[PDB]
């Protein structure tokens, strides 16, 4: 049992990636934002407040013959976004790329934040962190990957995000076709329930590599690269005009400037993010200030390797008891 589904950016900035998943019987196709930094499968639904759904496709549990109320079961999630979602919960058959899982917990939103309502391309989330994080009460649920694991050929999914382009999520196998050279695997701490790992240093452009341990999370659900104040300061110091703004709330640079690449260390390996991935374009329409894709971790308390870093690598989340994280060049 394997599964491969195409993931597609929702905008030309690649703010997020959406993958079609099939829920219910017969199937309802929803486009979900695969989030390795949460643990809840949540969807817009027939129960979602009608003043909170704006062109999103809803899951109607009443048309699924596989769908069943988990009586008493309840969810509430809160992101670092400040994003919120909550409601009640169903079990149902869920298929990703032809990999089918029955009795998946499908948490139906009665309530959703502004941030989600505004985002017409996202029909909900598929959380791919560790199940410890999952929110449902009073009985806590498992994640789709955890539900599939035993069925899979290998208990593993890979992430292959595209820059301005589709890519792929594969389940159950490693497409040796899709990367260059060798995969470097590195230790994962599950202790906070994140794909949490420790990077071995960094280089800015064609500079010297600094060996320094940077602890943070692989998160396909976060757009930007979030690194300590020290490292982020070194990066922008290399771009004439870049400064941290109070107003806009992070580093900006003159759109006419030239972003140096950013190198991160995975073991004795190195992954270069091209300076082009670091461009998030004009902070406002018309503006000649442009938003940087590397920002300070100082106010989140965790360093996040978000889509800007992951899109530059072929990433394996080995979910094997001793979980590991692999990086390859692509």
């Amino acid at each position: 049992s394997t599964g491969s589904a195409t993931t597609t950016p929702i905008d030309s900035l690649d703010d997020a990636y959406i993958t079609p998943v099939q829920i219910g019987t017969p199937a309802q196709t929803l486009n979900l934002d695969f989030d390795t930094g949460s643990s809840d499968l949540w969807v817009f639904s027939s129960e979602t407040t009608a003043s909170e759904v704006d062109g999103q496709t809803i899951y109607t549990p009443s048309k699924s013959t596989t769908a069943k109320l988990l009586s008493g079961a309840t969810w509430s999630i809160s992101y670092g976004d400040g994003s919120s979602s909550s409601g009640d919960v169903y079990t149902d058959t869920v298929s990703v790329g032809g990999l089918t899982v029955t009795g998946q917990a499908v948490e139906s939103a009665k309530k959703v934040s502004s941030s989600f309502t505004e985002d017409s391309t996202i029909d909900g989330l598929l959380g791919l962190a560790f199940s410890t994080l999952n929110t449902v009460s009073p009985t806590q649920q498992k994640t789709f990957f955890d539900n599939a694991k035993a069925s899979l050929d290998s208990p593993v999914f890979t992430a292959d995000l595209g820059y301005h382009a589709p890519g792929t999520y594969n389940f159950g196998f490693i497409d040796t076709t899709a990367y260059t050279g060798s995969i470097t695997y590195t230790a994962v701490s599950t202790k906070q329930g994140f794909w949490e790992w420790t990077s071995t240093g960094y280089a800015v452009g064609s500079g010297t590599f600094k060996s320094t341990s940077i602890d943070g999370i692989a998160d396909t659900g976060t757009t930007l690269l979030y690194l300590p104040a020290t490292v982020v300061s070194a990066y922008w110091a290399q771009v004439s005009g870049a400064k941290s703004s109070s107003s806009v709330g992070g580093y900006v640079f003159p759109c006419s400037a030239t972003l140096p690449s950013f190198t991160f260390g995975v073991g004795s390996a190195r992954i270069v993010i091209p300076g082009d991935y670091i461009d998030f374009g004009p902070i406002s329409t018309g503006s000649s200030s442009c938003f940087g894709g590397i920002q300070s971790s100082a106010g989140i308390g965790i360093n996040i390797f978000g889509d800007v870093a992951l899109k530059a690598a072929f990433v394996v989340f080995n979910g094997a008891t001793t979980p590991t994280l692999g990086f390859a060049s692509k």
Partner: peptide, 6 residues
Amino acid sequence: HPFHXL
């Protein structure tokens, strides 16, 4: 229009 998912 960035996203930061916990």
